[PDB]
Amino acid sequence: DEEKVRIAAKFITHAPPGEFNEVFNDVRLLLNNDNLLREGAAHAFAQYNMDQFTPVKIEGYDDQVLITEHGDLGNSRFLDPRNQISFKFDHLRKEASDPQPEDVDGGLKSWRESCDSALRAYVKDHYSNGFCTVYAKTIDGQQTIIACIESHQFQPKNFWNGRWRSEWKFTITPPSAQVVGVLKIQVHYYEDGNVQLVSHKDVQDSVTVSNEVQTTKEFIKIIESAENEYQTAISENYQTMSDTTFKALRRQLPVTRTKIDWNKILSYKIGK
Amino acid sequence: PAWXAXC
Amino acid sequence: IAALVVDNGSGMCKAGFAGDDAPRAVFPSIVGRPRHQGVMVGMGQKDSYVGDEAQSKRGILTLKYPIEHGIVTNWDDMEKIWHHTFYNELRVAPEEHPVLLTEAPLNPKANREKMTQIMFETFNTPAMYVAIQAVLSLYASGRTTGIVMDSGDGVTHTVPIYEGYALPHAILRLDLAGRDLTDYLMKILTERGYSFTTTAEREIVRDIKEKLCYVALDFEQEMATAASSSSLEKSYELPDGQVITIGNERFRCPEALFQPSFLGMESCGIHETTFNSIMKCDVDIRKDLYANTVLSGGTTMYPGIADRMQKEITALAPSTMKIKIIAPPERKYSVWIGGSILASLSTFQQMWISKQEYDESGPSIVHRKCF
Amino acid sequence: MSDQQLDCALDLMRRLPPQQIEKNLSDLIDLVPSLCEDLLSSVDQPLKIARDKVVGKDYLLCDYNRDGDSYRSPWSNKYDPPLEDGAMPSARLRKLEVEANNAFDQYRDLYFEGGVSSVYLWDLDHGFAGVILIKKAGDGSKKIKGCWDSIHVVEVQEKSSGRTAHYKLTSTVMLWLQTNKSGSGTMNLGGSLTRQMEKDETVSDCSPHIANIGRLVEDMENKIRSTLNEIYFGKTKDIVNGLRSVQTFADKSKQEALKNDLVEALKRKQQC
Ligand SMILES: Nc1ncnc2c1ncn2[C@@H]1O[C@H](COP(=O)(O)OP(=O)(O)O)[C@@H](O)[C@H]1O
Ligand SMILES: [Mg+2]
């Protein structure tokens, strides 16, 4: 038995997020028994859904909250920093339910809930469709803001699927603060043959702390700048420079700029 | 003049 | 007051007042300077010549096109083309009538400023607008959706226009056009011993290209026929009275539009860039496009080109999509025709950038649009 | 049941990344024995390099050059390991095979200026069939990495009279590019396309059958490559721009709105 559940775990863990549910269906059709797959897939889906960072909607909140390690309470429940209410998330099904209220002193927390509320608007202005969450946690005595932004786009009729992930950590320190983050892009097309795009960028920065409005504006300016430069390179450079590097791996026309001629190619072992 | 229609 | 419609084509400038179904001025967009000294001072000879004056005076002038491939190369030369357009070709003061300029999609944003600044500040236009050429073409063809294959002297442009909009993501600018096609004729003529070098001589070749050349429906079958029998051979005599005898060359030149390989061009051929454009669309509109293939601009005139284009693009598309080629006569001028219709709309008569708007906002009027 | 196991196995091998094919295939035959032979035949996978020790030259391994326990080298004409029988070509087909290897060695040299290739032909009662193989790795001195693989499989029908042959070409191109420049992070792109093309041509006294084959291969590789580059730029532009653009799209929507009303007015003024 144990090999089968490790083979399934690799497929479930690495699956493309427009297609992961279908891959689970594929693996459950491939093997004869449900239980050995279902029980491993729950543990995989915990880890997996957190790294997708994807939201769920809770039926009384009227908003979308992202899911992550910084949100994970243990005991199968997740935080909502805006609404301040914990909830259980199902890892197979679409919905989440039975919420419970969460209380704290919230000093450090309150300072960025403002900044979060600001960020939401700039998300609306970055993505046609887009969702966010800003986590508040003490890490080994450090004071941190963890801000995250998300997009899923899919359509079966188009045979393309396209996805976005972002992580930003800002460490509160007077007068000078530190920043760390990662940005990722994944796209798949499969109409007749297949093509895939995979990417990351990692960012480190230093900042200074002044006022609630100014930090709100500044963090957003960095996110704005970084995402727009990252998109600008990934469109404008790749439409030209990738043609030249792909050409350097295989050419479109030869060094001659002519179609080759079989008579001369057979006969003429042209000089060294 | 060499050329058929030119030099 | 009536509007003036101007088509800033690479080869010929088509111009006239709105509502008219044919332009009032059509001339080669050439600034021609002296090749030699003007010894007979009594002539009143000119620092440069333009249009049909340069083409009459061909043998003594260095003919420069101000647009090459598709971009303006020297603004003052283009400015002379415009000055001549107003004062000489149309015999009007540009201060006195609204003006429409055609423009190509994906032309860099600074060009829009230069054109706008020249038209208000050199030519004092009382109102102005700048339009994507290809849109005007379909518009003129009546239809409210389709794919344009517009090719003049400089750029081949493919645009899928849907619900009356250009879809910018699908626009395939192709650097193969009439001028490039002219060059290749020079070479295949050279094979048979005819030579042409001077820029004057280039324009002679252009006259030949517009007459003897045609598109064969299938290349080696035609060529095998031509290699067998002199029946496919015709002639056309230069200004110096000598006939040129020509066969195999007639289909061979415009074959290049289907085979950019013949010229070493890395870009795909005319049917190809059309398909390659179609496929980029919102999938639901694919069949909306295939029934609505629209050809235009001077290079689209060759006999048999539509029938070939059909048999060609039929291979690329999945079958039974009903691909149809819209290629009647008058497609020499669809682009300018479209502007003439657009400039007849009362809503458009509200929509122009006014002289007063530019006189308050300067070139910054375009920065809201250009991103 | 078992036909659906093979179908969902192939769907899985469409959805999983092409970089991990051999890992994922070994895992998939470990999760399903019995299907191993079907899987190894149906699933396409990167080629394997071989060295002919008698000649001192490289070749590539495929299921057509293989005959049971061993593979025939295109240079020495022997199998490794050696065999008591072996399904050899005819002597004249072998001579043709040498001529093909030489022609396609030039072809590859001109298009790639590196990597390795192989050519093999198998005798048929109605003509000949053939495989052309190519492999090329990227520059290991650079940040940018990659590979390109060619598979062309061709079947030739030699007709009874009028010296025509009909050619049926199948082709697959496998790609991965890894890219690590301009300070905008890194991107990996995977690609796999498959095509078929058919033609009939008259045999000539000046150009042998290989020149025909070759004309199809060149026209096919041009078509495949052009298709590939445009598929990359198409999806990498439209989806990435669509995900993280908003303001340009709002201003273009203002142009759409104005232009709509102009088009509505065109209905009336075109009638007028
Ligand atoms: N009947 C014809 N036969 C061949 N070529 C033609 C014909 N009519 C026009 N052309 C070519 O079209 C080119 C210009 O096309 P056009 O679109 O009218 O100019 P522009 O693109 O500069 O506006 C010229 O170079 C000319 O050679
Ligand atoms: Mg034009």
Numbering used by the authors:
A (entry chain F): 10 to 281
B (entry chain S): 1 to 7
C (entry chain I): 5 to 375
D (entry chain E): 1 to 272
Sentences from the paper on this structure:
Heterodimeric capping protein (CP/CapZ) is an essential factor for the assembly of branched actin networks, which push against cellular membranes to drive a large variety of cellular processes. Aside from terminating filament growth, CP potentiates the nucleation of actin filaments by the Arp2/3 complex in branched actin networks through an unclear mechanism.
Using these samples and an iterative classification strategy, we determined a Cryo-EM structure of CP-bound cytoplasmic actin barbed ends to an overall resolution of 3.8 Å. Local resolution ranges from 3.5–7.5 Å, with most actin monomers resolved better than 4 Å and CP to 6–7 Å. We observed clear density for phalloidin in all the expected binding sites, with the exception of the cleft between the ultimate and penultimate actin subunits. Interestingly, the two terminal barbed end subunits lack this density, suggesting that they are in an ADP-bound state. The primary interaction between CP and the filament occurs at the barbed end face of the penultimate and the inner filament side of the terminal actin subunit. The core of CP together with the α tentacle block all of the exposed barbed end surface of the penultimate actin protomer, with the α tentacle deeply wedged in a hydrophobic cleft at the barbed end of this subunit. In contrast, CP makes few contacts with the barbed end face of the ultimate protomer. However, a clear density occupies the hydrophobic cleft at the barbed end of this subunit, which can be unequivocally assigned to the β tentacle. The CP β tentacle interacts with the central binding cleft of the terminal actin protomer at the barbed end in a manner that sterically prevents binding of other WH2 domain-containing proteins such as NPFs.
